Homo-oligomer: A and B are copies of this chain.
Amino acid sequence: RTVLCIDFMVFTVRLLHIFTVNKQLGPKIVIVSKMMKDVFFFLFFLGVWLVAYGVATEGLLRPRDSDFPSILRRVFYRPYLQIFGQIPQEDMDVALMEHSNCSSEPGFWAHPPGAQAGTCVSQYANWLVVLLLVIFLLVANILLVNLLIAMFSYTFGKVQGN
């Protein structure tokens, strides 16, 4: 079933190839291919920023789960969703979660309510974690996205005639 579910995706995509003949959708479909260069640049810039912000935030929090699938989710998956409006403040802000002496390791720790946010996170410099979130949202949600719109508009005008 897992192969067929992905297979249905490929079959549905072929509807674009079938409709290339139509005069209304023909030119537009061809232009979409020319836009792939701009998309790859955005992915590269976003990938670099996601690695920098994701690792730094996870390193500052120091969650006690530290499982490899869990670490990957908190480094890549969670920062990625913050671009699209899913900001889990209760998982990264000490002022929202409750303080607990869960971990025997010295320091101050708080218990996030999320299931995959880790059992406990350090409170040492969470003002930096909040500050990093502010910077990340500005760079990713605003600067990077609006930059891609500018490159899409320039490319569309250039390659329209050809």
Contact = CB atoms under 8 A, between A and B. Distances in A.
Contacts of A30: none
Given A2-B125, A8-B55, A53-B9, A147 B32 contact: yes
A60 interface: yes
Copies in the complex: 2
Contact of A48 (B13, B42, B52, B56): B13
Contacts of A102: none
A24 B42 CA distance: 12
Interface string A13-36: 101100100001100100010010
Contact of A8 (B1, B39, B59): B59
29 contacts: A2-B125, A6-B56, A8-B52, A9-B52, A9-B53, A15-B48, A16-B48, A24-B40, A24-B41, A35-B147, A39-B143, A42-B142, A73-B95, A77-B134, A84-B87, A84-B137, A85-B85, A85-B86, A85-B87, A95-B115, A95-B116, A142-B148, A145-B146, A146-B149, A149-B149, A149-B152, A150-B155, A151-B156, A154-B157
Interface of A: 1-2, 4-6, 8-9, 12-13, 15-16, 19, 24-25, 28, 32, 35, 37, 39-42, 44-45, 48, 51-53, 55-56, 59-60, 62, 73, 77, 80-81, 84-87, 89, 95-96, 115-116, 124-125, 128, 130, 134, 137, 141-143, 145-157, 160
